[PDB]
Amino acid sequence: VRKVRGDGSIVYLDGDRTNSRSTGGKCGCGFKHFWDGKEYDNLPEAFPITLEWGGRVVRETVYWFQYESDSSLNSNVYDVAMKLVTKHFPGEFGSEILVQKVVHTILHQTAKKNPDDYTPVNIDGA
Amino acid sequence: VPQVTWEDIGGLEDVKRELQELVQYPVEHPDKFLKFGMTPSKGVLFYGPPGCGKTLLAKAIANECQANFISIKGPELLTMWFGESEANVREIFDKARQAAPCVLFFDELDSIAKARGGGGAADRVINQILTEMDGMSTKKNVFIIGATNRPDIIDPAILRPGRLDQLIYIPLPDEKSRVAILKANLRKSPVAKDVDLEFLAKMTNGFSGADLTEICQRACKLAIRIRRDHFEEAMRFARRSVSDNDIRKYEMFAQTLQQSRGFGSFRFP
Amino acid sequence: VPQVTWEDIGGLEDVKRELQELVQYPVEHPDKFLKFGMTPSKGVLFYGPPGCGKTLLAKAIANECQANFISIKGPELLTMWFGESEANVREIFDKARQAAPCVLFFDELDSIAKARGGGGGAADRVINQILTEMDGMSTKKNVFIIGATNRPDIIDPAILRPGRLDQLIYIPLPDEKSRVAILKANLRKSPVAKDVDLEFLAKMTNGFSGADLTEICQRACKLAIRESIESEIRRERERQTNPEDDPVPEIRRDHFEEAMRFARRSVSDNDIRKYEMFAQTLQQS
Amino acid sequence: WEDIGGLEDVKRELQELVQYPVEHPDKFLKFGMTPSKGVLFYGPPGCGKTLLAKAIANECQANFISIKGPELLTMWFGESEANVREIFDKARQAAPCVLFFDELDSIAKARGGGGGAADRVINQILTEMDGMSTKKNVFIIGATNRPDIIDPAILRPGRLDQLIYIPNDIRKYEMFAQTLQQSRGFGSFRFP
């Protein structure tokens, strides 16, 4: 149980089992789960990625969102990498090289190409 | 003046319209461009999976406007780079300048970038291309179409306004485009009416133009020893040169290009 | 001499004042300079987001002084670097000396630094020759060096020292007045319906660089041209088949509305943060 | 062919690609064909690639120009890429000819199994292949003990597109061959 937002919408922190029907699947739940203020047909994958810049080490885990029915909530290496670099190296010149590096790393990691395997993030609840 | 026409690529209506607007309109109606005070776009940059008809698109648009077509293959650019012979780029443009109107097509603008992998994204050959494009008079109808299988590694300075500013995504052929490609490939060979040429295109989803060409070549090479059985036998050897993982890069690059345009709601008072 | 005036940008009043001080006073008031014993500044370096009008600023200041303007783009620097022909720098300055007073402009002083990645040092052949020529200048022929860099961090510090490009000027994205001026300059010599509220268009394009606004105007003109061509083609298939009011005499409001659909900000908030942090670092010193 | 025992399918493919165009130009034209400009071998060293090329040349009575690895490397050293032109000219003079590159990967090997994958010598080889007229029946037969490091650009249609396996060292080639066959799993297409 969680707090409510007045109108009746639960706070629904990351990974919660929402009340919306899962248009997609591969979850055995039949409901859209929650992540960063949005509803997704299935839990995102996750993999660590190293961000090296100015001698700074960052242990940031990228959350991939492939296998999404709406075809609009699916992840995007360019957007994801831009967000990561901006969040961890805001306003630093030459960050585009780091963004390209992160894009390549995410593409390689997500290119395991075993669509049968999914590895949902380990989150309690459905 | 290529003999390739739009029917040889089939679909890509949006790309066809953009190419028309960028080539046919300035050449056919310079008066309207002068009236509206718009400078015609100097160039365009096709990006997409390998062997999807980028060269075919350039040749088709050249044929549509009946403009001379000059193809600068990637091996030529690498020859310039390895031998430090970038200066010849100048005369290459001069050639395109001489055969005006022209559609100067660079098959692989990223060939040099790929060949390099510590340095930046600037190289002597691409720098010469940039200098020629900047120093090119817009009065002469010379259009540069730079294909690229790696839209990111390409030098950003080439996408600057006044250059190959427009980026066009050439996706894998769809069902209609695949049917058109198969028909064009099987145009100089005797093919029996038994083969539908549409059901095949329907099944071979995600097959680049090169894949369809290889399938047809295998089928009619067996026939050299055409019928439905031989097409099926060759199709057993069919290979998808581009996998969905490769597609993702281009699909999501185009998606992020389109999402940046988030001012469509703008309405005047 | 450029034809660009300050109305083409119509913004950055402080930058205009500074440029007048360092380019206009020495050529307009030599008496004051020799009386006060203050050496004229050799040059300035504009740093800001891409397509923010740095070239426009240089052209406008050159036009105001009625001084010859010759611009050296980054591709030229890269040509002189790859070919190991840095000696050309010399003749370039000579040309600037010949057309005195002159405003030498380097579109991308960081182009060579970028080409090497932002294992060696920060000094290179072409920039070294530029420094050598700047030092070996008459200092009274009134030749002003206005470098322009999108990446001020990787600029060789030797360039940013007293007596050589001492002043760094931040050319930010245009403000509302600057955006209005840029739009008016772009739609100049173009037929735009008088009901097109360019003031509103500038108002709703916060964060758009000058290049972005030029792209918007070009897209509007392109849409108008496409509409004109389509109407002309429509004239036949109705005439010559079933045997005149101009379809599109001006770029109407709908054209700009549709153009704004393909309008994107080439300078994200992160880049603005980059440049603002650099300026803050310079100022807090 | 008796010099090599076995590899019946290899000979099948070799003669298919070489003998027919020289012997039946009319049949190829009837079907509107562009004969493959070349082919690439790959397998354990000393498996008979050179003698296979020689045998197919003998069956066709076509001259067999051999460019060994040392020649390609010598072209690489000293920036002698231009010599490639001459080699193809030497191949072109022999109208029915088989041009054999004993080690296409030798230069890629020398650079190390920092740059990309293209190099001046292979670049000139590609340029000559692209500009080689189909009327002159010159067949390029590349050979590589390490097909993984071979430049991908040379395995493109209009170039040495076909790859033939010429059989802990073997497992590498077996896995490579499977990787060239695992995704060919569309052999079920049946016409209606």
Residue numbers in the entry:
A (entry chain D): 546 to 671
B (entry chain F): 471 to 587, 593 to 700, 731 to 774
C (entry chain A): 471 to 588, 593 to 717, 724 to 765
D (entry chain E): 476 to 588, 593 to 646, 750 to 774
Question: What's the publication's text?
Answer:
To better resolve these regions, we used symmetry expansion followed by focused refinement, with masks focusing on the N- and C- terminal ends of VCP. This enabled us to obtain improved maps of specific subsections, including a 2.9 Å map resolving three VCPIDs bound to the D2 domains of VCP without symmetry expansion, a 2.9 Å map of one VCPID with stalk region bound to the bottom interface of VCP D2 dimer and a 3.1 Å map of the VCPIP1 UBX domain bound to the N-terminal domain of VCP, both with symmetry expansion. To enrich the dominant conformation, we again used focused classifications and refinements and were able to visualize additional density corresponding to the stalk region that binds to the VCPIP1 OTU domain (2.9 Å resolution). Further, this allowed us to visualize the movement of the OTU domain (aa 215−355) using three-dimensional variability analysis (see “methods”), which contains the catalytic cysteine (C219) responsible for DUB activity, and the stalk region that connects to VCPID. The flexible nature of the stalk and the OTU domain prevented us from obtaining a high-resolution structure for these regions of VCPIP1, thus a portion of the stalk and all of the OTU domain are excluded from model building. Nonetheless, we analyzed different 3D classes to evaluate the trajectory of the stalk and the OTU domain. From the density visible, the stalk region moves ~4 Å and the OTU domain moves ~13.5 Å from the first to the last state. Each VCPIP1 molecule makes two distinct contacts with VCP, one mediated by the UBX domain that engages the N-domain of a VCP protomer, and one with the VCPID that forms contacts with D2 domains of two adjacent VCP protomers. These interactions position the catalytic domain of VCPIP1 in close proximity to the end of the central pore of VCP.
